[PDB]
Ligand binder design. Structure first.
Ligand SMILES: [C][C][C][C][C][C]SC1=NC([O])=N([C]C2=[C]N=[C][C]=[C]2)C([S])=N1
Length: 133
């Protein structure tokens, strides 16, 4: 019952600073535009120790599966090849991506009836709020 409050199908309801976050990450113009237009559903499931997170939109359908604390290689929606580790820290799922000497952290937390995603790259934070579908 690790992560139960995260499990489910979630729909994006608001975004702030995502274009600026993607700029800082290095996402190019055309991908930023089409990805910033995405209205993703985030689908989170658990089977034993394996957590799966899917992001589905008209831009891309992506899926990762992982065990907490155990690094994996990921291809991101914007085609970076990154090394990822996801942990649960005080109720927050913390996802760190490392590539080309850079790092970004994506945090997922439950707040009221929302799932709030905070994406940080150097000084820039984007907040992406989801509700149950
Ligand atoms: C750069 C990226 C792009 C994307 C595109 C599509 S939409 C979406 N997806 C996803 O997954 N998410 C989570 C994350 C991850 N990573 C990073 C950040 C975040 C969100 S909130 N949204």
């Amino acid at each position: 019952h690790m992560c139960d409050a995260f499990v489910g199908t979630w729909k994006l309801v608001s975004s702030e600073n995502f274009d600026d976050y993607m700029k800082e990450v290095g996402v190019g113009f055309a991908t930023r535009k089409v990805a910033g237009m995405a209205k993703p559903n985030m689908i989170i499931s658990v089977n034993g120790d394996v957590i799966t997170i899917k992001s589905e939109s008209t831009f891309k359908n992506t899926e990762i599966s992982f065990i907490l604390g155990q690094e994996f290689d990921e291809v991101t929606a914007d085609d970076r090849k990154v090394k990822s580790t996801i942990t649960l820290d005080g109720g927050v799922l913390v996802h760190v991506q490392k590539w080309d000497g850079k790092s970004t952290t994506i945090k997922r937390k439950r707040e009221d009836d929302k799932l709030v995603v905070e994406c940080v790259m150097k000084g820039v934070t984007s907040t992406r709020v989801y509700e149950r579908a």
